């Protein structure tokens, strides 16, 4: 049982919204030991769905793994301008991951709530996502 985290700062969230496509991937982060398994984050600005069109979708993708499957629990959260966690989403259940398989939330955060300056979620037009993974 290994636990690690990864912070993803997306620059020019609104400024380069159209250059971001239907989906954009993040850099690959390891187990915190850099030995066997590699993950990355996959976010959908539009949600590519009718029910989640007003939402931003966030996923945890398993890039490479030595074994056949990997069971892991994940937790997504947004870091506000003062570094604090907000709008956290997670499932107490663990999920099976295979090379090229991903798990996440289609409706993770409302775009309206995200772009609202009152929530202080986009300082310097940067969206800072936080992910914590617990491999079993």
């Amino acid at each position: 049982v290994v636990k690690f985290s990864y912070m993803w700062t997306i620059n020019n969230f609104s400024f380069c919204r159209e250059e971001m496509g239907e989906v954009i991937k993040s850099s690959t982060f390891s187990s915190g030991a850099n030995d066997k398994l590699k993950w990355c984050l996959r976010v959908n600005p539009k949600g590519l769905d009718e029910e989640s069109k007003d939402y931003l979708s966030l996923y945890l993708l398993l890039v490479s793994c030595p074994k056949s499957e990997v069971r892991a629990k994940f937790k997504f959260s947004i870091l506000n301008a003062k570094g604090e966690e907000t709008k956290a989403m997670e499932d107490q259940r663990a999920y099976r991951f295979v090379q090229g398989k991903d798990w996440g939330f289609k409706k993770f955060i409302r775009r309206d709530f995200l772009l609202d300056e009152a929530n202080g979620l986009l300082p310097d037009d940067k969206l800072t996502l936080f992910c914590e993974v617990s491999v079993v």
């Binding site: 989403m89 499932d91 398989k101 991903d102 798990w103 996440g104 289609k106």
Partner: peptide, 7 residues
């Protein structure tokens, strides 16, 4: 936990 999905 109910709320989760994949691609």
């Amino acid at each position: 936990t109910p709320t989760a999905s994949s691609s």
